[PDB]
Amino acid sequence: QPHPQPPPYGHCVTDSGVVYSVGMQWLKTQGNKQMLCTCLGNGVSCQETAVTQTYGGNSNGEPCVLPFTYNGRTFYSCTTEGRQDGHLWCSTTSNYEQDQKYSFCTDHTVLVQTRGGNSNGALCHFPFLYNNHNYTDCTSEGRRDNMKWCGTTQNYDADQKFGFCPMAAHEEICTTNEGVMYRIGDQWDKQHDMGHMMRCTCVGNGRGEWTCIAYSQLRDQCIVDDITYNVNDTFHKRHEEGHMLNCTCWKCDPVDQCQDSETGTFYQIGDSWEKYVHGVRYQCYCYGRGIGEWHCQPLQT
Amino acid sequence: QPHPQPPPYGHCVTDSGVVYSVGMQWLKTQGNKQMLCTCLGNGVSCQETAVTQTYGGNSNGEPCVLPFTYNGRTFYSCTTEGRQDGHLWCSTTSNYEQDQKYSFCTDHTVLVQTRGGNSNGALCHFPFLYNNHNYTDCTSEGRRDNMKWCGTTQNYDADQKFGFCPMAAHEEICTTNEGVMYRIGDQWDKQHDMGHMMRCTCVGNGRGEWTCIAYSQLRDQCIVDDITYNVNDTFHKRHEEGHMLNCTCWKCDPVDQCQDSETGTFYQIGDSWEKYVHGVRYQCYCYGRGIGEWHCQPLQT
Numbered sequence A, B: 001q002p003h004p005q006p007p008p009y010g011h012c013v014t015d016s017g018v019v020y021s022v023g024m025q026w027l028k029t030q031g032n033k034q035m036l037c038t039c040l041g042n043g044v045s046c047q048e049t050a051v052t053q054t055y056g057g058n059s060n061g062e063p064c065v066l067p068f069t070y071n072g073r074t075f076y077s078c079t080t081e082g083r084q085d086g087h088l089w090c091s092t093t094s095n096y097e098q099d100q101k102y103s104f105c106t107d108h109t110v111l112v113q114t115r116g117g118n119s120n121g122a123l124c125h126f127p128f129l130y131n132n133h134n135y136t137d138c139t140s141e142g143r144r145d146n147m148k149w150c151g152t153t154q155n156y157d158a159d160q161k162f163g164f165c166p167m168a169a170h171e172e173i174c175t176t177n178e179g180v181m182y183r184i185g186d187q188w189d190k191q192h193d194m195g196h197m198m199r200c201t202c203v204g205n206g207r208g209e210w211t212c213i214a215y216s217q218l219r220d221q222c223i224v225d226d227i228t229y230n231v232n233d234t235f236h237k238r239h240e241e242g243h244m245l246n247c248t249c250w251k252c253d254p255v256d257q258c259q260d261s262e263t264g265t266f267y268q269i270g271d272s273w274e275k276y277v278h279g280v281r282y283q284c285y286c287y288g289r290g291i292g293e294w295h296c297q298p299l300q301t
């Protein structure tokens, strides 16, 4: 394979045969595990994927470790999970339950892996210097076709190293507990309902999640219940989340108890329970949060 | 300007001189106003920007009108605003307060305006037919460089019309009430604090929003208050949102009242108020939602 044109002076020849220039960063991904690699003067340095441009939190605005674990799950991006305030947060270590350290995220708390260009899929380097101005995100500037690119080193004017910034990706398939594969936007009727039928949609939410909705009516009050799932794959474990809304018809009355959708049983806030559904043991919990919010995860060994 | 190679048979020569093929769609944007244009056999047809791949809501899963108005503001994407359940929703008409019709969004409730390629910035056409398979999102397939593209017509195998899908954009600047411009990630200390000092960050949230945080400690309890702002521009009006958290040290006790950050006054749920700050009249409201949530908008004429 040929080698880049200097500057920068110095190259890294990686295990796969790919040649990166000094100052470049790229992602080494093994199954679901991710490493952030750097081409230093003496060779390749790999470490925990750190994502910057954070603020607040108990960690003095330290960078994210992406992915991170929290509440038995893995998060590949910042989340609002666990928060009533809607703020996107991330763990500053790989294990949140252990270390308990976090920061809040901004529109720049992401790593952009480039395509095409000079850089062999290297990450964007921010800030990159172009026309004597520092760009902290991808630009259309200097291009007739208006395509969004970035420098893959600190100085593009000098190094001429770049790549194109693609649209962010998400999983395209929702796989049902019955093994049925659907695409984002597909609709079907729920396979295992509590007499009260449900309408399903493959929503995605970057994890191939599907949501099932059931509408109840007494002409005075309208009870709306929804359950969201995802099946396990290489990146994600199974998860289940149910809500219940009690609206006058709308005007919402808080729902402070949970109803498991596959049993029909009523649980109170702070209650845990187990269920065997479709040949798998689940552990459940009732949060409430005025929306009858309950979660389930498969029983772990 | 030259004309495309058929198929498709037939072309549209637009006001700007741009030539689109029959079956193509593009966005005509006038200031903050947006139109969705189609190249039909007889010419150009424009209408309200409709975004599909929705589900649920009181409208039978009708498409989004993007942008839409809700609660005195304009939304260019789906929002969770107003919802305690975190579900992304959109209005099915341009005015929500009037028509009250909505759908819920999926990972496909977006319109992707292409760059480069054959198509002059045309929107992605989903599904597009490639290698006798229908693609409902951008692909890496058929490309060595792994760049993400889409067909800009129903049949790419036949029409050969495509464009590249760029990374989604957001506003890069947070402009302060004092007129100070910051970039996403910049930090500063708040200009007008209630004795209790605040640390600011230019967060973005696709609207150049900046959040100010103040930490209070009694060693037993930790009160955390945050205020989020954006100044007016061509796309967005001014908005202000404050929260207050009361955590033991964490374990949260719900905060069911509001404290205006620029006055220090305590308001209860369902209370409205006015304030004159930095030479502008504001109308305010106390929602609570266990997080002392209050919003302000400038007084309208």
Ligand SMILES: *[C@@H]1O[C@H](CO)[C@@H](O)[C@H](O)[C@H]1NC(C)=O
Pocket (backbone or CB within 6 Å): A127, A129, A132, A133, A134
């Ligand atoms: C550009 O950024 C680098 C550090 O990111 C800084 O050292 C340099 O002073 C900046 N210069 C310009 C031209 O903005």
Ligand SMILES: *[C@@H]1O[C@H](CO)[C@@H](O)[C@H](O)[C@H]1NC(C)=O
Pocket (backbone or CB within 6 Å): A232, A233, A234, A280
């Ligand atoms: C998915 O989960 C089932 C356990 O219910 C397990 O047997 C299977 O090996 C898992 N496979 C994948 C693709 O993770």
Ligand SMILES: *[C@@H]1O[C@H](CO)[C@@H](O)[C@H](O)[C@H]1NC(C)=O
Pocket (backbone or CB within 6 Å): A221, A223, A246, A253
């Ligand atoms: C909804 O409200 C009615 C009274 O307002 C109450 O009886 C009912 O329990 C609430 N929800 C359910 C699950 O019935």
Ligand SMILES: *[C@@H]1O[C@H](CO)[C@@H](O)[C@H](O)[C@H]1NC(C)=O
Pocket (backbone or CB within 6 Å): B127, B129, B132, B133, B134
């Ligand atoms: C592809 O999609 C079009 C409608 O979107 C449909 O009419 C056609 O049958 C589909 N065919 C294939 C090959 O998937």
Ligand SMILES: *[C@@H]1O[C@H](CO)[C@@H](O)[C@H](O)[C@H]1NC(C)=O
Pocket (backbone or CB within 6 Å): B232, B233, B234, B280
């Ligand atoms: C922004 O708001 C101020 C009113 O406070 C108004 O005078 C000014 O014209 C507005 N300008 C823009 C750029 O929208």
Ligand SMILES: *[C@@H]1O[C@H](CO)[C@@H](O)[C@H](O)[C@H]1NC(C)=O
Pocket (backbone or CB within 6 Å): B221, B223, B246, B253
């Ligand atoms: C936080 O909790 C303490 C008692 O637990 C309460 O006195 C205090 O009012 C709460 N918040 C504030 C704003 O003081």
Ligand SMILES: [Zn+2]
Pocket (backbone or CB within 6 Å): A003, A004, A010, A011
């Ligand atoms: Zn070399």
Ligand SMILES: [Zn+2]
Pocket (backbone or CB within 6 Å): A085, A086, B241
């Ligand atoms: Zn909010």
Ligand SMILES: [Zn+2]
Pocket (backbone or CB within 6 Å): A107, A108, A136, A137, A138, B170, B171, B172, B184
């Ligand atoms: Zn940006």
Ligand SMILES: [Zn+2]
Pocket (backbone or CB within 6 Å): A178, A191, A192, A278
């Ligand atoms: Zn079954």
Ligand SMILES: [Zn+2]
Pocket (backbone or CB within 6 Å): A171, A207, A208, A230, A231, A232, A233, A234, A235, A236
């Ligand atoms: Zn998955």
Ligand SMILES: [Zn+2]
Pocket (backbone or CB within 6 Å): A226, A242, A243, A244, B085, B087
């Ligand atoms: Zn819900």
Ligand SMILES: [Zn+2]
Pocket (backbone or CB within 6 Å): A071, A239, A241, A295, A296
């Ligand atoms: Zn959960």
Ligand SMILES: [Zn+2]
Pocket (backbone or CB within 6 Å): B003, B004, B010, B011
């Ligand atoms: Zn022609």
Ligand SMILES: [Zn+2]
Pocket (backbone or CB within 6 Å): A241, B085, B086
């Ligand atoms: Zn939730």
Ligand SMILES: [Zn+2]
Pocket (backbone or CB within 6 Å): A170, A171, A172, A184, B107, B108, B136, B137, B138
């Ligand atoms: Zn997709």
